[PDB]
Design a protein around this ligand. Structure first.
Ligand SMILES: [Zn+2]
Ligand SMILES: [Zn+2]
Ligand SMILES: [Zn+2]
Ligand SMILES: [Zn+2]
Ligand SMILES: [Zn+2]
Lengths: 244, 244
């Protein structure tokens, strides 16, 4: 049974870097090797849900082989959710590419990209991870990447380095509610904009929503882990989450 | 009379970095301060020409004030070229943001973004810089950013560090033809795919085309300078060009 992973993304490198990259490389050594991976990124935020099997914007290159079989299986599992199927791969954002180059350096794990539907509310994205859960017993690792705090208008690129108190506030409300159980509509992490708090940490939903894909996939029983965490440049949250 | 600048973009930082960043900061200290700037990036590659006056994807933030006056003046100058006018700013690619944060750290120069028309041939993009030339006598600096060699399938992110010979070959054909004069249709840098050479260095045109915007703006008389140059990771060319 494969784990699902939400990674806070960014180290702005690298090669021989930091705590985060060593946590990614990390889980790539330590976690059960997947038959294939469904990648969810903050940066594939589209009207409607798209899927690529990667049979062919960003100053990056991650030549993982595609899995047309997993793509079709994704489309079927999601039906009647209408899915658009791209032939070509989508470019990987620097952050996602940064997680993947550290995690599985050799780009030898077959892969599908899944996009996040803009037009849908948080509860729906949580329901998505509920549907993706079945794939975890079929040798498939879910890797979602984004940032539970993500306001680049508040980011302090040089000085000083302490976490803004509102950043730590929202982040702790995230961590304290990972294991919440009950109706989806009443989930604190689904109703995240109910926090002070919420809109300032996430003025648009895309960097936060990927966590819900991972949380949607939790059975209520298996452990939930935090392989690495951190708030960089005052408001970039680096909170990573392991399900199972 | 304002200079036009093509910058090869990437240092993957920074703050206290390298030769390239110090060349950018650099020209920002040394060049005549502009009333406003038209930014052209490799990464705004669209069907049709777009313009933003910046009255409102990338893990970046460059809060330069817009210039609606320059935007309208751009639309008028280009007519009958059909232009789409966005209210909102487009996100800056890391490379462009990297050039601008070093060049004009304070983000206090008014600014317009101009996009590159996908559907048009190299000669047309050269003609674009011919039209943009007039704005140089109106206090306006053209800043184009991309990379005259740009194949991320050949990039050696770690080892070793020597420039591929084909990379140096195409690059030198670029440099040897900056000052070429004659009919546009017969310009070596317009007919760049005529080199061995060309398609391998530039499998799609977007990172190269921005130079033509700058070269289009040369009168035949003023100096053409190379403020910095370099080939990193075997095939990322860092060749920068100053017109006037
Ligand atoms: Zn680029
Ligand atoms: Zn980037
Ligand atoms: Zn954000
Ligand atoms: Zn991001
Ligand atoms: Zn390229």
């Amino acid at each position: 049974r494969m784990p699902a992973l939400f990674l806070g993304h960014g180290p702005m490198n690298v090669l021989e870097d930091n705590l985060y990259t060593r946590s990614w490389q990390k889980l790539g050594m330590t976690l059960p090797r997947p038959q294939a991976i469904v990648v969810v990124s903050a940066h594939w935020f589209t009207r409607g849900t798209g899927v690529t099997a990667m049979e062919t914007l960003y100053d990056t290159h991650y030549p993982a082989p595609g899995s047309p079989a997993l793509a079709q299986r994704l489309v079927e599992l999601l039906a009647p959710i209408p899915v658009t199927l791209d032939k070509e791969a989508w470019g990987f954002d620097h952050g996602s590419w940064g997680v993947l180059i550290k995690m599985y350096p050799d780009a030898d794990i077959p892969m599908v990209q899944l996009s996040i539907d803009s037009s849908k509310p948080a509860a729906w994205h949580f329901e998505m991870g509920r549907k993706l859960a079945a794939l975890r017993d079929e040798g498939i690792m879910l890797v979602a990447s984004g940032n539970v705090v993500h306001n680049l208008r508040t980011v302090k690129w040089h000085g000083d380095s302490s976490p803004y108190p509102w950043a730590t506030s929202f982040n702790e409300y995230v961590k304290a509610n990972l294991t919440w159980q009950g109706p989806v509509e009443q989930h604190p992490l689904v109703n995240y904009l109910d926090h002070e708090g919420g809109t300032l940490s996430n003025p648009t939903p895309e960097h936060y929503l990927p966590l819900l894909y991972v949380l949607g996939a939790w059975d209520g029983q298996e452990p939930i882990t935090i392989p690495v965490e951190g708030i960089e440049m005052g408001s970039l949250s680096m909170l990573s989450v392991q399900i199972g």
